[PDB]
Design a protein around this ligand. Structure first.
Ligand SMILES: OC[C@H]1O[C@H](OC[C@H]2O[C@@](O)(CO)[C@@H](O)[C@@H]2O)[C@H](O)[C@@H](O)[C@@H]1O
Length: 404
């Protein structure tokens, strides 16, 4: 009978690829359906380029794709509309915000699978060791704490020790980190939901200059090449006071044999001042049935299974990845394993989106401009003031004649 083939999460990032292949295998066994799993590059933007090859070919060789929250506007032509396959009641079990994200010109491109938001990881043993009782609320405090702890730990002989790791590589992850920087300085959303390209302002410039100020000082020089896992590795080996990253890093840091098991917490990222907004970039992945699948009924069944309560529960318990079902945030087992889901839920719900809705199908071009201009500040090649002006100009060109 049919072979349902799934291009899912990458085995190069955390345990998501292995766990998803397992879930797909379980559905295959449960229903007596053959399945195959197709692996992917680590970085989202490289995965998009891979999958676009299949879509351009109208290839039947993948039935189900795991797609980024930033993609629906890009991928819609290649998605089977799921709206007819779900009742209103079923669809309301997901966060409406993510359903809406995934709905393009009325077409439900994909089911919400797990959400995501940027957060601050901090070593609580080290904060306590150096007389700090709370994680930093301001970027200035993060700097001051990082400098003092780094000076201490280096003096004690850990030459591998740094104050802060983050995603500074030129790729989509840096757009994520930069939106957080910019938004948390009161510099806006880069491109606002109404289409206004707002990034050329003094607050956004300062946010970028501040980030430059970290590189080779409180963060490694090599941070300009770090994606999620490079940052996680330094952090997880015990060599960073702080890390910006997504929720998945929590379960991995708690695993038996982690050098940092039991020594960290998470909180909202810091911000420039008390009146700035909290910044957490909205991420997360969705489940799309291919418009080119020869087996839409079966593929929809698998996608509904993957997006079910019990699979999302397993995702949350074992991989600390965020449900797209509000009911799971009151599940006793989810909360007992991840108590930080409770206090950060409103951070997750208030996560700031990248400009994928307003840029639509041109989002990837916009983001490439953002990360390349941000990266030029991190490297010390441009100041934030020039970079934001240049970025405005590039985004104006990219979005000229695009209306949302
Ligand atoms: O790099 C930006 C990208 O980050 C996140 O997806 C990448 C991987 O992160 C996970 O560990 C989940 O946090 C894996 O499951 C992902 O493959 C984020 O969710 C995206 O929205 C974002 O574009």
């Amino acid at each position: 009978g049919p072979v349902i083939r799934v291009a899912g999460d990458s085995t190069a990032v955390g345990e998501g690829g292995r766990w998803m292949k397992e879930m797909v295998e379980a559905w295959g066994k449960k229903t007596g359906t053959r399945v195959e799993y197709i692996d992917s590059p680590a970085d989202t933007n490289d995965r998009l380029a891979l999958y676009q090859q299949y879509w351009a070919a109208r290839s039947p060789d993948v039935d189900v794709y795991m797609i980024d929250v930033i993609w629906p506007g890009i991928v819609a032509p290649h998605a089977l509309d799921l709206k007819p396959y779900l009742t209103e009641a079923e669809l309301k079990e997901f966060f409406p915000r993510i359903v809406q994200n995934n709905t393009i010109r009325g077409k439900l491109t994909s089911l919400p699978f797990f959400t995501d938001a940027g957060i601050l990881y901090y070593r609580k043993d080290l904060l306590e060791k150096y007389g700090y009782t709370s994680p930093p609320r301001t970027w200035n405090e993060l700097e001051q704490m990082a400098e003092r702890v780094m000076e201490g730990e280096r003096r004690a002989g850990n030459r591998d020790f740094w104050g802060f790791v983050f995603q500074g590589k030129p790729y989509e992850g840096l757009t994520c980190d930069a939106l957080e920087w910019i938004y948390s300085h009161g510099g806006g959303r880069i491109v606002e939901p109404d289409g206004t390209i707002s990034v050329n302002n003094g607050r956004a410039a300062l946010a970028l200059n501040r980030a430059h100020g970290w590189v080779g000082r409180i963060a490694p020089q090599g941070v300009t090449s770090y994606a999620e896992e490079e940052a996680r590795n330094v952090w997880q080996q015990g060599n960073s006071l702080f890390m910006r990253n997504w929720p998945y890093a929590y379960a991995l840091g708690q695993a038996e044999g982690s050098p940092i098991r039991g020594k960290f917490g998470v909180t909202v990222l810091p911000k420039a001042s008390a009146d700035a907004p909290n910044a957490a970039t909205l991420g997360g992945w969705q489940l799309m049935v291919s418009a080119y699948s020869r087996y839409p009924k079966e593929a929809v069944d698998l996608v509904k299974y993957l997006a079910s309560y019990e699979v999302q529960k397993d995702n949350a318990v074992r991989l600390s990845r965020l449900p797209t079902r509000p009911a799971l945030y009151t599940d006793r087992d989810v909360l007992a394993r991840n108590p930080w889901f409770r206090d950060l839920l409103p951070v997750f719900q208030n996560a700031v989106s990248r400009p994928s809705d307003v840029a639509g199908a041109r989002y990837n071009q916009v983001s490439e401009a953002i990360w390349t201009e941000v990266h030029s500040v991190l490297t010390g090649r441009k100041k934030g003031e020039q970079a934001v002006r240049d970025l405005e100009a590039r985004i104006r060109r990219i979005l000229r004649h695009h209306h949302h």
